[PDB]
Amino acid sequence: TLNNVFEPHVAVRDAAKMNIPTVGIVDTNCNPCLITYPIPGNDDSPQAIQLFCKLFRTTINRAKEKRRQMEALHRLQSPK
Amino acid sequence: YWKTGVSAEQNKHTESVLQRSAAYMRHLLISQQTLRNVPPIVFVQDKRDLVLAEVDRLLAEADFGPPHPNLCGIDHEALNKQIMEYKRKKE
């Protein structure tokens, strides 16, 4: 949530201006007030960032897969 | 820049000496941690000093051979002509 000059990333305010929800990792030096779903945690360590990336990737693929299955079941019921 | 004594020959030797140790001098400062990232160093002689020395070398080598209206700011002459010319018209 911080840029390379240790200031809030411009997209935090600009996503609030456009009313876009934001899920952000927020370390002790960050400002979570405008983050819709703040996740307090380490943002600097490679092992911490790699864990979060896997979680967001597994989660998104599960949700996309569930939609495919949900449509097939409901779609199949329409003829059946 | 480094202070340069009058003697040109000694300055030339001093210039070479300092320049050789430029790398080591940088290491000494970088090692002590006074300045973390020091760039390459140069030693230069003030051009003013060099010229003054050269103007003395050439001078020794050189051989000297065997042993009114415009003052005030008004062109009184021109003004007189302007007046005399007017007087010619008057008369």
Partner: protein
């Protein structure tokens, strides 16, 4: 200029090109290979491989030319050299065997040693500091030192000569007098140097 900055000045030295490859320094050897992929300026109309071409004398000719009259200026230089050769031959024939040895009869060698006797080591630059004109002793480059000697010669002859004397007769009489360190052009050099000693302490004003 109609030449782009990528053009190279031509090299018109006959011996340089015909030297054995091993006789050339690798720096010169490298330049020749590079020049094969570059553009070369056309040689000047007066640039030739002639063995009798002297750059110093050719330059002195151009400094006498008026209004592009090269034929006249070259003729004046040719008449001068001859007037100097004929003046030394007369002296040589009318001199004893001992004196004959010293006498120099080469006009090209009298010209070069004459000019060098007139060149000044130091010059003056006019400077206006605080609304007053001061001239500060300067050290002259090799180009400025050579120009002044030729300029001083071409100006003594053009002006300070009788009305009916001719330039080949005044210039010949001056090259030979400078060749012996007695002429008025040498006197101009002595005055320039003597003034520099007067302004010795005013060199500080230099900013360039």
């Amino acid at each position: 200029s109609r030449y782009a900055p990528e053009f190279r000045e031509p090299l018109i030295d006959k011996e340089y090109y015909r030297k054995p490859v091993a006789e050339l320094t690798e720096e010169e050897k490298y330049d020749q290979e590079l020049k094969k992929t570059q553009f070369i300026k056309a040689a000047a109309a007066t640039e030739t491989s002639s063995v009798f071409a002297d750059p110093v004398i050719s330059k002195f000719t151009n400094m006498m030319m008026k209004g592009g009259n090269k034929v006249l200026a070259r003729s004046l230089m040719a008449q001068t050299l001859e007037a100097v050769k004929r003046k030394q031959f007369e002296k040589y024939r009318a001199a004893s065997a001992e004196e004959q040895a010293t006498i120099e009869r080469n006009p090209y060698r009298i010209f070069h040693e004459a000019l060098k006797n007139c060149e000044p080591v130091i010059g003056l630059v006019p400077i206006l500091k605080g609304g007053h004109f001061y001239q500060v002793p300067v050290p002259l480059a090799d180009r400025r030192r050579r120009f002044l000697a030729m300029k001083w010669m071409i100006t003594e002859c053009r002006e300070n000569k009788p009305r009916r004397t001719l330039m080949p007769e005044k210039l010949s009489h001056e090259l030979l007098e400078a060749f012996h360190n007695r002429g008025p052009v040498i006197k101009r050099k002595h005055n320039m140097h003597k003034m520099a000693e007067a302004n010795r302490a005013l060199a500080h004003y230099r900013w360039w």
